[PDB]
Design an enzyme around this catalytic site. Structure first.
Site, PDB file in Angstrom:
ATOM      1  N   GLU A 295      -7.430   8.513   6.262  1.00 57.94           N
ATOM      2  CA  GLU A 295      -7.718   9.106   7.571  1.00 57.94           C
ATOM      3  C   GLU A 295      -8.364  10.485   7.409  1.00 57.94           C
ATOM      4  O   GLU A 295      -7.722  11.517   7.656  1.00 57.94           O
ATOM      5  CB  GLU A 295      -6.452   9.181   8.455  1.00 57.94           C
ATOM      6  CG  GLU A 295      -5.548   7.910   8.429  1.00 57.94           C
ATOM      7  CD  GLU A 295      -4.632   7.751   9.658  1.00 57.94           C
ATOM      8  OE1 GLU A 295      -4.087   8.773  10.167  1.00 57.94           O
ATOM      9  OE2 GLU A 295      -4.439   6.594  10.113  1.00 57.94           O
TER      10      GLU A 295
ATOM     11  N   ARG B 115       0.833  -1.192   0.000  1.00 58.44           N
ATOM     12  CA  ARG B 115       0.000   0.000   0.000  1.00 58.44           C
ATOM     13  C   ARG B 115       0.874   1.251   0.000  1.00 58.44           C
ATOM     14  O   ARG B 115       1.682   1.465   0.908  1.00 58.44           O
ATOM     15  CB  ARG B 115      -0.943  -0.030   1.197  1.00 58.44           C
ATOM     16  CG  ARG B 115      -1.735   1.215   1.387  1.00 58.44           C
ATOM     17  CD  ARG B 115      -2.573   1.117   2.639  1.00 58.44           C
ATOM     18  NE  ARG B 115      -3.350   2.339   2.779  1.00 58.44           N
ATOM     19  CZ  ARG B 115      -3.307   3.144   3.837  1.00 58.44           C
ATOM     20  NH1 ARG B 115      -2.534   2.832   4.874  1.00 58.44           N
ATOM     21  NH2 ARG B 115      -4.044   4.255   3.851  1.00 58.44           N
TER      22      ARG B 115
ATOM     23  N   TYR C 145      -4.624   1.795  16.054  1.00 53.13           N
ATOM     24  CA  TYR C 145      -3.386   1.816  16.817  1.00 53.13           C
ATOM     25  C   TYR C 145      -3.632   1.564  18.293  1.00 53.13           C
ATOM     26  O   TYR C 145      -3.001   0.695  18.910  1.00 53.13           O
ATOM     27  CB  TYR C 145      -2.708   3.171  16.618  1.00 53.13           C
ATOM     28  CG  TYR C 145      -2.092   3.305  15.251  1.00 53.13           C
ATOM     29  CD1 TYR C 145      -0.933   2.624  14.932  1.00 53.13           C
ATOM     30  CD2 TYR C 145      -2.689   4.072  14.268  1.00 53.13           C
ATOM     31  CE1 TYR C 145      -0.366   2.721  13.688  1.00 53.13           C
ATOM     32  CE2 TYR C 145      -2.132   4.167  13.012  1.00 53.13           C
ATOM     33  CZ  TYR C 145      -0.970   3.487  12.732  1.00 53.13           C
ATOM     34  OH  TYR C 145      -0.396   3.575  11.493  1.00 53.13           O
TER      35      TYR C 145
ATOM     36  N   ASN D 157      -7.868   1.997  10.061  1.00 51.20           N
ATOM     37  CA  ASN D 157      -6.536   2.225  10.634  1.00 51.20           C
ATOM     38  C   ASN D 157      -6.644   2.236  12.154  1.00 51.20           C
ATOM     39  O   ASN D 157      -7.214   3.175  12.722  1.00 51.20           O
ATOM     40  CB  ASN D 157      -5.956   3.554  10.143  1.00 51.20           C
ATOM     41  CG  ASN D 157      -5.678   3.556   8.666  1.00 51.20           C
ATOM     42  OD1 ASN D 157      -5.898   2.560   7.995  1.00 51.20           O
ATOM     43  ND2 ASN D 157      -5.234   4.688   8.135  1.00 51.20           N
TER      44      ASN D 157
ATOM     45  N   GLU E 182      -3.867  -0.009   8.130  1.00 50.89           N
ATOM     46  CA  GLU E 182      -2.799   0.392   9.022  1.00 50.89           C
ATOM     47  C   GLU E 182      -2.971  -0.241  10.384  1.00 50.89           C
ATOM     48  O   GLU E 182      -4.075  -0.285  10.928  1.00 50.89           O
ATOM     49  CB  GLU E 182      -2.732   1.896   9.211  1.00 50.89           C
ATOM     50  CG  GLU E 182      -2.170   2.622   8.062  1.00 50.89           C
ATOM     51  CD  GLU E 182      -2.131   4.093   8.322  1.00 50.89           C
ATOM     52  OE1 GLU E 182      -2.061   4.491   9.513  1.00 50.89           O
ATOM     53  OE2 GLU E 182      -2.200   4.861   7.340  1.00 50.89           O
TER      54      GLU E 182
ATOM     55  N   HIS F 241      -2.801  10.997   0.460  1.00 48.36           N
ATOM     56  CA  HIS F 241      -2.229  10.801   1.788  1.00 48.36           C
ATOM     57  C   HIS F 241      -1.615  12.127   2.233  1.00 48.36           C
ATOM     58  O   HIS F 241      -0.403  12.217   2.490  1.00 48.36           O
ATOM     59  CB  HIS F 241      -1.205   9.646   1.810  1.00 48.36           C
ATOM     60  CG  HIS F 241      -1.125   8.882   3.110  1.00 48.36           C
ATOM     61  ND1 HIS F 241      -1.205   7.500   3.170  1.00 48.36           N
ATOM     62  CD2 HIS F 241      -0.869   9.295   4.379  1.00 48.36           C
ATOM     63  CE1 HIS F 241      -1.046   7.101   4.422  1.00 48.36           C
ATOM     64  NE2 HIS F 241      -0.833   8.169   5.175  1.00 48.36           N
TER      65      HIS F 241
HETATM   66  N1  LIG Z   1      -1.970  19.551  24.013  1.00 50.24           N
HETATM   67  N2  LIG Z   1      -1.651  18.316  24.052  1.00 50.24           N
HETATM   68  N3  LIG Z   1      -1.005  17.729  23.098  1.00 50.24           N
HETATM   69  C1  LIG Z   1      -1.343  16.460  22.303  1.00 50.24           C
HETATM   70  C2  LIG Z   1      -2.368  16.800  21.180  1.00 50.24           C
HETATM   71  O1  LIG Z   1      -2.575  15.695  20.303  1.00 50.24           O
HETATM   72  C3  LIG Z   1      -3.859  15.382  19.748  1.00 50.24           C
HETATM   73  C4  LIG Z   1      -3.790  14.188  18.767  1.00 50.24           C
HETATM   74  O2  LIG Z   1      -2.546  14.325  18.029  1.00 50.24           O
HETATM   75  C5  LIG Z   1      -2.373  13.225  17.092  1.00 50.24           C
HETATM   76  C6  LIG Z   1      -3.399  12.261  16.969  1.00 50.24           C
HETATM   77  C7  LIG Z   1      -3.264  11.185  16.086  1.00 50.24           C
HETATM   78  C8  LIG Z   1      -2.088  11.067  15.264  1.00 50.24           C
HETATM   79  C9  LIG Z   1      -1.997   9.951  14.493  1.00 50.24           C
HETATM   80  C10 LIG Z   1      -0.645   9.463  13.895  1.00 50.24           C
HETATM   81  N4  LIG Z   1      -1.145   8.181  13.282  1.00 50.24           N
HETATM   82  C11 LIG Z   1      -0.167   7.267  12.531  1.00 50.24           C
HETATM   83  C12 LIG Z   1      -0.058   7.744  11.088  1.00 50.24           C
HETATM   84  N5  LIG Z   1      -1.385   7.173  10.580  1.00 50.24           N
HETATM   85  C13 LIG Z   1      -1.515   7.672   9.226  1.00 50.24           C
HETATM   86  C14 LIG Z   1      -0.047   7.271   8.742  1.00 50.24           C
HETATM   87  O3  LIG Z   1       0.530   8.192   7.841  1.00 50.24           O
HETATM   88  C15 LIG Z   1       0.808   7.142  10.008  1.00 50.24           C
HETATM   89  O4  LIG Z   1       2.034   7.845   9.675  1.00 50.24           O
HETATM   90  N6  LIG Z   1      -2.398   8.095  13.593  1.00 50.24           N
HETATM   91  N7  LIG Z   1      -2.931   9.054  14.281  1.00 50.24           N
HETATM   92  C16 LIG Z   1      -1.030  12.004  15.421  1.00 50.24           C
HETATM   93  C17 LIG Z   1      -1.195  13.098  16.322  1.00 50.24           C
END
Ligand SMILES: N=NNCCOCCOc1ccc(-c2cn(C[C@@H]3NC[C@@H](O)[C@H]3O)nn2)cc1
Ligand SMILES: N=NNCCOCCOc1ccc(-c2cn(C[C@@H]3NC[C@@H](O)[C@H]3O)nn2)cc1
Ligand SMILES: N=NNCCOCCOc1ccc(-c2cn(C[C@@H]3NC[C@@H](O)[C@H]3O)nn2)cc1
Ligand SMILES: N=NNCCOCCOc1ccc(-c2cn(C[C@@H]3NC[C@@H](O)[C@H]3O)nn2)cc1
Lengths: 448, 448, 448, 448
Positions: free
Chosen positions: C166, C77, C296, C294, C352, C121
């Site tokens: 996503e 993918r 995690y 996806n 994912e 993406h």
């Molecule tokens: N104030 N406090 N601070 C913290 C604030 O965070 C809020 C949430 O932030 C996030 C939430 C979710 C992600 C995320 C990363 N993936 C993995 C990637 N999936 C698509 C693919 O390309 C992978 O590379 N999935 N979800 C990143 C950041």
């Protein structure tokens, strides 16, 4: 490489505070402090640490004093737990409280170690806080009675006195930024607490004079030194605000009978005024015999409107930092010692200087080389000022023991002697033996 | 946690010198220099190290240029081995010599790397030293012929030129203190060497214009900074002497048409005079387009009559030092740039800045964190000066490669790329990948 | 000690994205994306990391395909860099861009590896962002032109297509929380971006059929799972909001022709409305052949009014976390698949699933046992759902390579093949050889 | 990250059992137990370990109680060695036996630690086993006399009572699976032993009431929680059988006056019947003041006809396991606490919770981080249930000491305090100090 020789009667010491080391927080009728309350609140102190036990120096002081004699030290700076004397801050004394401190001071004098007594090192009886604490002029009279009780009880046993330790911390860290007990965030309250602190200081020195108490008396501010990032007048103003709120705000009243006008103007635009009443400035200006200064770090600052209530932002210049994150730049101690000559060539004691270095015991020793390094650079600066003719009279290491380091709890170690808080075992660090050599010789040789 | 962003036109580079890296000292008709002679004399260079092989950059320049291309640098500062062009320094050129610098310079230009050409980086042909070397005005004309030949063959290929690298080292370290080639210890000789150096600079610059050669031309002094231990006038005087001999002694003639009078007075009371001939001061004052500044360390000095010919003793303040012993105190770089505004807001490039950190390859990497620490602190001071409005145009790390560090030999590593001198294998250090990020992004972030 | 056997037709694969791995960001007429712009802005990505070089998979795709061939996977993918095809996003194609994906796709097919093509993406051309980006329906038509060009050039070479990867990240993380490019913090904008995304999906799917393009088409949402701390209706409501915005918000329009009404009500009380135009809900409801999910991590949430715009606070339950901080609790994957049966027993691929485990190369190996631990627990949940009769068709590990992990940069490693970003050397981790066994055998055995 | 604050009068404790810690197996007229016999049989206990010496707590209890005071614990759960009171189980008391337990309880009450007394923790005097043990209704009267002797002897010294610890272990592990003493493998015997245990429990609570004994009394089952692999009714039945045989089988008689009918039906098809006599169910239904529940792990089960007598097979889902192999999944403690509300919101104590983690002493400490982790996740679940309104009144760590862990011998360590069985030295583990903080603060902060 270079030898730094110190004055013959230079006073070498170490320093502690009561809540950080004593423990026995409920023993012998001791009353609660605002810090007991603060440390017993979730989220206020790292890891939920508190001072209930600490170093257990309420019970183990004899071991600590024996270690100080072998260190060859000439003075020991300690503070008195106010709620051990007046559990409520109101006249009914606790003789047990007084009895503890009598056993301490007698062992000190019998070992040739001069007591250096801090009256207020932040443990305001919670009873007085309930009524508004330092934000309430009533606490002024409660403290004057506390100080009077000590001036009386230890007359002839103690020759060196300090009223308050680090007024900027008691006023602005505690009541503007909410970082220390009681944890408030209101400028006006912080300014109120500062003023009532200056008045309670004035009235206690006066009593000291009228009582004919033995020795000399002063106050021990923590001192800021900030240096501007740019040549701008804005960055220079931002550094002046940072510098003056720590020292000038409290010393200009005491020496020059006025608050720093440019800070007065600054707070006035934030809606705060100093609650000065008639005769107050006259009380604050009572003459003092010396001051103590507390130094750890210095900063490079610039003006930023979003950078707190002083609109003074610190820049990370990439310098190495202690294990609590403060950069090591010893020249600020020399600069600020020259800066304070604006109040005259007053007698100055270095009442706190030290480093957070969290090395523990490995193969029977604590190899805290970074602490020796820190002390070496800063002791060079003390000699440097003395050589310029400044009346720097003594130096006290912060601290004798690893202890309860306020909102960081026990995770941030400052001692020249290691304390295992699970066992209460004392282990002199390498800095201890290095310091023993310096004070015993009365000269330093810079190396490594 | 602070972001420092640099100008869009900022010139990031790296710096070497011919004898330190090239090797092939008897190859292709290259003649002997005073450094071949000095390094081939027992007792002169630590461990009897010499530059016969060095980094073998006579043969391996292509790999070195591949690595600086992947680094993303925009300029490469190198020096020309004079006895590769004129082996005897007296007219018959070596086309083989010229050929080498042509493949280097063309390879740099083809990769988008701007040559920054130093003509004299201390390798004076031994033939001229037999005639007295720089103490003999005859070599003045020999140098001018060298520079013309270089302007002539490399017009349009090199847009940045420097006549001399670190005149104080060429004159006083080499001919008063005897530490560098040719190693004499005579005050008057050192002053002669210095004066004839400036005359050759003026004439080579006056010729630069006359030929309409491409680019800009200046000189690259090493710069001293000393601050007085005490407030005394003597300590401030001792620091003024230290500072002024490195920079003022050479820059005041070029910009202001006079030698520092206070040092003239100092030497005249030691029996030394500047051999100024009619027209000399005007030849030296030929306008230059920019200067290079070389900064490593700063000091705290005091007046001491027994402390050498400048009677200025530097004090061990207990600061941490690099692996060659120089304390790390980056503010001197900010300090000296502001000092130099006495000559106007001239264009200034940092042609050298670096640290001796002797870490080797462990598990395939060179974990030279103390070099990353040093470089970050000093790049903060560059931004600080630009932000103050000073015309700081570029920065070259000393050095691209671990190389022959003069009287220290190979034992003192300054490179951001490690060189194993047994195999000539290049291994980029962690500082290299750290630098790659800063120059590619054109902004710095403080951490650790 | 349990055997888990998978269907004979089960699709084992690996997953990457264009910007995370490709590099060559200025090569062959590729235009800038919003992630180039975001990663080139100070303060946006940890350490100032960016995707200019990444894994250099623009040049090294042949090695990467050799490694996935030896892995024995049946699908790969990947995503298409939009500004490689339409650098400005407005019609003039870049044949060089198309050429790259043709050598990749052909090399995959020649090795028996099925391309699984993600069109979007997150690398929206900066030119369209200048016009308002996804908040401007004009780019809707720009995307549809992109997808047609891809269906057009790659008909019969790619049998599996995904419109968007996503959507919740594209809309709310990027335009409400400001954590990903373009980094705005506006509720209404986030809802606009989401709606125009769905319209572009519908139109690209409606066109997919009309062109008779080979294969199947769907969309790949990231899926949330939260479980209430208490039994209260508020805690169950807070979890419903968390869950539904990730999946329901996008899947209910596609399958059931309506937005989740309870979240519509939630946003309308914050001043935000969905900009539905006539025909929109019908364009979105275009039938799709399957969805990607996806997964995690999962969470335990409670209702908290101060806890962001969804007022849903996730509680630290003390569970072990990966190296990026996400707790490992695999049952949420089983839970969410059953949740999704509300849309019918639709074909679902796990596009994912992975863990940040930051182990490096030691003695030639990457001993990433915590990644093997994570992958085994989650592959158990895939078998469990298939065994429950759910149409789970495939599984793609995130990720094939350590790559640029968006606002975390390269500090957060998700790959089963380690990439040294200083050399671009690929080293398959122990998880790689572990995965090679599971996919080659088509059954799993629980151990450790 | 999250603070979990506990009820003001919440009872923090630790737990032991007599045979696991006491030693002195032949001292002061103590008679043999069925476990002495079992541990003295080759092949029954790992490595031929037995409890002859154990932790020598028959002699060292004063040290253990001092450590519990420093822990700040409020309760200590222990069991009484039946053959120390009635060596033969038949009327002739051993005052020495009683004298030991009087010294224990007096030290507990003098230190402010409330005794929590388990009457039967598996050491049935071998004398009674010879006559059939619990398979013989005669043992019922022998136990009632034993309990009566304790109810009388410690009236007013003990306020918390439990009759039997883990009836499923005494009945089915010991007499169906042969894993614990007496080691039988016959369903009918296991069912017999369970029933006579319920009757002896009923008659002892009755006596407790009629004696007006001080305090409250209950029973302490170990609780199973199994969750189905599939949605099938078969897997759900298999989990109901596993769950109900541990708890419902004993609690439904006590609270609801009947055995679980679906298990009755199940055993009836295996040829076993409960030997209920007239008045028995009436005896078992005597009201109790509270129950204790013992929790360690939970499982994911499915139906399998070959999977033991319950045809319930556990699936290895790949979760991390303690050093005895049990997976860590703390949510089961919350689920089962809600499940048991089917008997009402009864008072519930957590009488055992702990982890097998076999770290030993390295550099003076036991770094059992995985035990702190385990406790953190499960203490979160206790707070979680309390917050849902469940009457969870206390929590006791299994165990105070590393001890004799039944068929595993000493190879499986559960203590928060390390015991070296060659020296009997006690070393508080890191979990000890962490637990001291939690109970002393009465709040938990989840971290790491
Ligand atoms: N104030 N406090 N601070 C913290 C604030 O965070 C809020 C949430 O932030 C996030 C939430 C979710 C992600 C995320 C990363 N993936 C993995 C990637 N999936 C698509 C693919 O390309 C992978 O590379 N999935 N979800 C990143 C950041
Ligand atoms: N976002 N903004 N607001 C909050 C930002 O952090 C603010 C935190 O400030 C500070 C500043 C200073 C200190 C401090 C501690 N010592 C050392 C002690 N000296 C007296 C003695 O007893 C020692 O133990 N000196 N100074 C602590 C915290
Ligand atoms: N009696 N006591 N003994 C000690 C006596 O030392 C007196 C001073 O010696 C010195 C002083 C300064 C240097 C020096 C080396 N660089 C670094 C190089 N820069 C030009 C470039 O080529 C780099 O390689 N800058 N300055 C060396 C030796
Ligand atoms: N092939 N099939 N048959 C045999 C298959 O193995 C069966 C082994 O079963 C078990 C099940 C459970 C236990 C057990 C131990 N604790 C902990 C103690 N709690 C009371 C206290 O004193 C602690 O020491 N709780 N549960 C042991 C063995």
């Amino acid at each position: 490489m270079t030898i730094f020789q110190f004055p013959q009667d230079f006073m070498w010491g170490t320093a502690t505070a009561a809540y950080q080391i004593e423990g026995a927080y409920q023993e012998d009728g001791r009353g609660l402090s605002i810090w007991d309350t603060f440390a017993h609140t979730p989220g206020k102190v790292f890891n939920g640490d508190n001072g209930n036990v600490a170093c257990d120096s309420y019970h183990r002081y004899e071991e600590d004093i024996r270690l100080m004699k072998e260190l060859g030290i000439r003075t020991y700076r300690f503070s008195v737990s106010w709620p051990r004397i007046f559990p409520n801050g109101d006249g009914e004394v606790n003789q047990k409280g007084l009895d503890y401190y009598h056993r301490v001071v007698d062992l000190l004098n019998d070992n040739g170690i001069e007591p250096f007594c801090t009256l207020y090192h932040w443990d305001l009886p919670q009873a007085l806080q309930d009524a508004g604490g330092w934000g309430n002029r009533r606490t002024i009279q409660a403290f004057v009675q506390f100080a009077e009780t000590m001036f009386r009880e230890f007359h002839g046993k103690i020759q060196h006195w300090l009223t308050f330790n680090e007024p900027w911390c008691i006023a602005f860290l505690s009541n503007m930024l909410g970082v220390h007990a009681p944890g408030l965030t209101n400028l006006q309250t912080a300014i109120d607490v500062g003023h009532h602190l200056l008045v309670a200081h004035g009235l206690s020195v006066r009593r000291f004079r009228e009582l004919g108490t033995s020795g000399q008396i002063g106050i021990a501010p923590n001192v800021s030194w900030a240096v501007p990032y740019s040549t701008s007048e804005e960055d220079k103003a931002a550094c002046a605000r940072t510098i003056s709120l720590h020292s000038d705000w409290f010393l200009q009243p005491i020496y020059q009978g006025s608050y720093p006008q440019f800070l007065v103007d600054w707070f006035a635009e934030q809606g705060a005024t100093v609650p000065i009443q008639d005769g107050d400035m006259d009380i604050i200006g009572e003459p003092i015999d010396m001051i103590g200064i507390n130094y750890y770090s210095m900063s490079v600052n610039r003006f930023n409107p979003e950078a707190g209530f002083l609109q003074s932002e610190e820049i990370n210049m990439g310098l190495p930092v202690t294990d609590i994150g403060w950069p090591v730049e010893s020249r600020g101690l020399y600069e600020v010692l020259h800066y304070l000559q604006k109040y005259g060539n007053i007698d100055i004691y270095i009442t706190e200087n030290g480093a957070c270095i969290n090395d523990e015991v490995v193969n029977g020793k604590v190899q805290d080389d970074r602490r020796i390094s820190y002390m070496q650079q800063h002791l060079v600066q003390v000699h440097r000022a003395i050589h310029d003719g400044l009346h720097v009279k003594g130096y006290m290491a912060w601290s004798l023991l690893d202890n309860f380091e306020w909102a960081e709890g026990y995770s941030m170690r400052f001692g020249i002697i290691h304390v295992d808080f699970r066992t209460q075992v004392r282990t002199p660090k390498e800095s201890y033996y290095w310091y023993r050599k310096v004070v015993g010789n009365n000269w330093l040789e810079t190396r490594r």
